[PDB]
């Protein structure tokens, strides 16, 4: 139940 | 033609994502349906709750459960798939 | 220039959504950073866990907590913001 | 908490 934030970006 | 850009997920589950998305891209023309298909399959197979974004232009900032995140490209479409809740 | 396309949230939280996104577009150029800003503000103000997607081309299929979902345009960029987990 | 699924699509 660890939670992690992530960002993504298309080109 | 799968290019995995960012992943926090078992290799098996990664390979399932890609295959599931490939089948979805064969079947549906609209991004939302492709996302719907993949999300729904993942809720069934790996338990809720999954969320899925499919597109050619977007940025995102999301939060996921450990080991339940993938972001990859399949041809000209990017796919974000992750579990939270 | 806000067009709310779909919402399941209070009017106030909608309005906060639009204004937080407007501030984020004024400050950032990259979609991902705009999304990060919005998502972070919402986790702070309303408690985690929020997720935000910003872009001109995407379809999504997601699951959200009652009353915590918005999908709107600000100019040519679509913004999806919702809480889950 | 109630959970609801939704789909969106840019035009």
UniProtKB/Swiss-Prot annotation, chains B, C:
Induction behaviour: Up-regulated by ATMIN, PAK1 and estrogen.
Domain of life: Eukaryota
Keyword Oxidoreductase assigned: no
Subcellular location: Cytoplasm, Cytoskeleton, Microtubule organizing center, Centrosome; Chromosome; Cytoplasm, Cytoskeleton; Nucleus
Tissues/organs with expression: Ubiquitous. Expressed in testis.
Effect in UniProt of substituting residue 63 to A: Abolishes interaction with PAK1
Keyword terms, alphabetized: Acetylation, Activator, Apoptosis, Chromosome, Cytoplasm, Cytoskeleton, DNA damage, Dynein, Host-virus interaction, Isopeptide bond, Microtubule, Mitochondrion, Motor protein, Nucleus, Phosphoprotein, Transcription, Transcription regulation, Transport, Ubl conjugation
Region of interest: Interaction with ESR1: 63-85
UniProt PTM comment: Phosphorylation at Ser-84 promotes recruitment to DNA double-strand breaks (DSBs) by TP53BP1 and ability to inhibit MRE11. Phosphorylation at Ser-84 appears to control the dimer-monomer transition. According to PubMed:15193260, it is phosphorylated at Ser-84 by PAK1, however, according to PubMed:18650427, the DYNLL1 dimer is not accessible for PAK1 and the phosphorylation could not be demonstrated in vitro.
Membrane-spanning ranges: none
Assembly, per entry: Homodimer. Monomer; the monomeric form is incapable of binding to target proteins. The cytoplasmic dynein 1 complex consists of two catalytic heavy chains (HCs) and a number of non-catalytic subunits presented by intermediate chains (ICs), light intermediate chains (LICs) and light chains (LCs); the composition seems to vary in respect to the IC, LIC and LC composition. The heavy chain homodimer serves as a scaffold for the probable homodimeric assembly of the respective non-catalytic subunits. The ICs and LICs bind directly to the HC dimer and the LCs assemble on the IC dimer. (Microbial infection) Interacts with human spumaretrovirus Gag protein; this interaction is critical for intracellular microtubule-dependent viral genome transport toward the centrosome.
Name of this chain's protein: Dynein light chain 1, cytoplasmic
């Amino acid at each position: 139940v660890g939670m992690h934030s992530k960002g993504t970006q298309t080109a | 033609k799968a290019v995995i850009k960012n992943a926090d997920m078992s290799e098996e589950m990664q390979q399932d994502s890609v295959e599931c998305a490939t089948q979805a891209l064969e079947k549906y023309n609209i991004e939302k349906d492709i996302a719907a298909h993949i999300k729904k399959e993942f809720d069934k197979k790996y338990n809720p709750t999954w969320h899925c974004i499919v597109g050619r232009n977007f940025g995102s900032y999301v939060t996921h459960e450990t080991k339940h995140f993938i972001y990859f490209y399949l041809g000209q479409v990017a796919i974000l798939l992750f579990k939270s809740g």
